[PDB]
Amino acid sequence: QWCAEEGESCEVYPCCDGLICYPTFPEPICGV
């Protein structure tokens, strides 16, 4: 996959299962 899933950084690509980009450091993560 090219999109960012659950537990991956969405600094280059968006979410996959409809997750949200959390303000996590250093880079945000996709989570519902």
What does this structure look like?
Helix content is 0%, strand content 19%. It is built from no helices and two strands. With 32 residues, the chain is an all-beta fold. The termini are far apart.
Layout: helices, strands, pairs:
Layout: E1 20-22, E2 29-31
Antiparallel strand pairs: 1-2
Provide a concise account of the structure shown:
The chain has strands spanning 20-22, 29-31.
List its traits.
mainly beta, two-stranded antiparallel ribbon, toxin, knottin, sponge
Q: How much is the radius of gyration in Å?
A: 8 Å
Which band does the percent of strand residues land in?
A: 15-25%
Strand order of the biggest β-sheet: 1-2
The shape, in one word, is globular
